[PDB]
Amino acid sequence: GAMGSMERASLIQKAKLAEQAERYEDMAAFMKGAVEKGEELSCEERNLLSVAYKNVVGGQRAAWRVLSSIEQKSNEEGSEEKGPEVREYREKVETELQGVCDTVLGLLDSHLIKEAGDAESRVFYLKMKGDYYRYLAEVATGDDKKRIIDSARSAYQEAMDISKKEMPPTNPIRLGLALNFSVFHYEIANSPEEAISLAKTTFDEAMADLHTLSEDSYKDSTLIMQLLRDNLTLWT
């Protein structure tokens, strides 16, 4: 680890600076270094980790989609053969994406998940595990595709089970998990009815619990609820 010589606190400070500077690759490396110190992460620190890698892989996913579209077009009838370059470069970006996913999954497996005992931390990491297996599923075309999908599903399902037992229906992590698992159903598992059902039930149960919240918690919860509504609007 290139970050092995840097203090945990300095890695966290620098991750924050990197976020301010919109340097998400640096942010992700700092946060990897912090995780590898071996201590559990606070809430703020888990958020830094997630934001960093979400931004890095988000950029790779967007790039992969642009390239995959160009590649598809090149493989339609009446398209002029332009050699292996589009496939090669889509593969390059794909491999880099896969590497990032593998890195995040490796952090989760060694050893964030196993040390996470509180519902809020355990659900957050299991949601991440689901997300990064979903990103691997997005680009999978091989022998392992079904197993990758199932890995995403299993991680999301464990998170869902804990969240429903341990968190209120308005809890932002419970909402965010549901939002993402619902997307997994729609986009990855070919289960749009499950996606819709989950988004709707999650929204409605949250609605009914808003009355219990402070103004600030209300703001947090309603923000993610609107994302559930946005997807339902997209899908219905």
């Binding site: 939002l179 993402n180 997307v183 986009e187 994302l227 946005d230 899908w235």
Partner: peptide, 5 residues
């Protein structure tokens, strides 16, 4: 694409 967080 749909919203995720």
């Amino acid at each position: 694409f749909p919203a995720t967080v």
